[PDB]
Design a protein around this motif. Structure first.
Motif, mmCIF file in Angstrom:
data_model
loop_
_atom_site.group_PDB
_atom_site.id
_atom_site.type_symbol
_atom_site.label_atom_id
_atom_site.label_comp_id
_atom_site.label_asym_id
_atom_site.label_seq_id
_atom_site.Cartn_x
_atom_site.Cartn_y
_atom_site.Cartn_z
ATOM 1 N N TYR A 38 0.817 -1.209 0.000
ATOM 2 C CA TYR A 38 0.000 0.000 0.000
ATOM 3 C C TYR A 38 0.858 1.269 0.000
ATOM 4 O O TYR A 38 0.467 2.293 -0.565
ATOM 5 C CB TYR A 38 -0.863 0.048 1.264
ATOM 6 N N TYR A 60 -6.718 7.098 3.546
ATOM 7 C CA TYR A 60 -5.354 6.628 3.346
ATOM 8 C C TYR A 60 -4.514 7.679 2.611
ATOM 9 O O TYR A 60 -3.374 7.952 2.984
ATOM 10 C CB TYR A 60 -5.330 5.300 2.587
ATOM 11 N N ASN A 167 -8.600 -6.111 4.814
ATOM 12 C CA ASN A 167 -9.028 -5.420 3.597
ATOM 13 C C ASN A 167 -9.407 -6.448 2.546
ATOM 14 O O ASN A 167 -8.729 -7.458 2.381
ATOM 15 C CB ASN A 167 -7.922 -4.525 3.036
HETATM 16 C C1 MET Z 1 -4.762 1.504 0.799
HETATM 17 S S1 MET Z 1 -6.269 2.034 1.611
HETATM 18 C C2 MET Z 1 -7.202 0.481 1.564
HETATM 19 C C3 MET Z 1 -7.564 0.071 0.134
HETATM 20 C C4 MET Z 1 -8.358 -1.236 -0.005
HETATM 21 N N1 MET Z 1 -8.589 -1.532 -1.425
HETATM 22 C C5 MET Z 1 -9.700 -1.124 0.713
HETATM 23 O O1 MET Z 1 -10.655 -0.596 0.146
HETATM 24 O O2 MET Z 1 -9.870 -1.554 1.856
#
Ligand code: MET
Length: 235
Positions: A38, A60, A167
């Motif tokens: 990430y 984020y 996640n």
């Molecule tokens: C990098 S922030 C998190 C992104 C991830 N695709 C989510 O929606 O949980």
């Protein structure tokens, strides 16, 4: 052509379909650049390695901007992926024993997110009044122990913890389905819709805007259904 950064996994598959739409319907060439943390695609965007990325939500982005000072902005939402709580030790939340271990992501925004979900689960209460930490836990009846792990490690923790907030992009490759396997998930109306981010100077670039449009195409929506089922909600 246009270089777009994604996280390897299900979202990269989604982007592959968007890339086809981009070429077939917009005459636009998109080169997908995959990453495995990430914390990297925003550095790649800032340093010019990619021209856009699609991997994160706004909290984020705001958090990493505060940390690193990147001049990056969102040019549109893609999908929200309601976060689930998963376990290989319990089938119901009431089964949690006193002092049970609960794993959550360790990055600021997703950690706060997971704590909010544990509160929704009626497992804890946070101090009254998006940036929550375990220090903000005001009530913890079962004296649950919070374990902070990197997001990409959470899916492999289920042998060592009683419950984990994971996640969706990481749950799916681990054979975990938000709809089928989660004991509980967030609602659809959260602040966690994912976005397409670009450099501030490129916010009006029509080719980057076209990428957002492609990600809202019927074909991409249809593919999202196949890849994520109810785990992805158009945003
Ligand atoms: C990098 S922030 C998190 C992104 C991830 N695709 C989510 O929606 O949980």
């Amino acid at each position: 052509m246009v270089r777009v950064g994604t996280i390897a996994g299900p979202e990269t598959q989604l982007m592959e379909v968007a890339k086809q739409v981009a070429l077939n319907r917009y005459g636009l060439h998109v080169n997908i650049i995959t990453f495995s943390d990430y914390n990297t695609p925003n550095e790649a965007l800032a340093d010019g390695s990619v021209d856009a990325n699609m991997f994160q939500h706004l909290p984020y982005l705001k958090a990493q901007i505060e940390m690193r000072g990147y001049k990056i902005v969102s040019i549109g939402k893609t999908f929200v992926y309601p976060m689930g709580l998963y376990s290989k030790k319990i089938t119901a939340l009431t089964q949690l024993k006193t002092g049970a271990k609960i794993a959550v992501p360790s990055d600021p925004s997703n950690e706060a997110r997971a704590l909010l979900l544990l509160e929704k689960a009626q497992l804890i209460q946070l101090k009254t009044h998006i940036n929550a930490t375990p220090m903000d836990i005001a009530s913890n009846p079962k004296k649950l122990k919070i374990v902070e792990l990197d997001a990409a490690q959470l899916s492999r923790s289920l042998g060592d913890v009683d419950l984990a907030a994971i996640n969706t992009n990481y749950a799916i490759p681990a054979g975990l389905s938000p709809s089928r396997d989660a004991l509980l998930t967030e609602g659809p109306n959260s602040p966690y819709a994912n976005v397409v981010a670009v450099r501030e100077d490129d916010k009006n670039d029509p080719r980057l805007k076209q990428l957002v449009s492609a990600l809202h195409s019927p074909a991409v929506l249809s593919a999202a259904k196949k890849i994520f089922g109810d785990g992805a909600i158009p945003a």
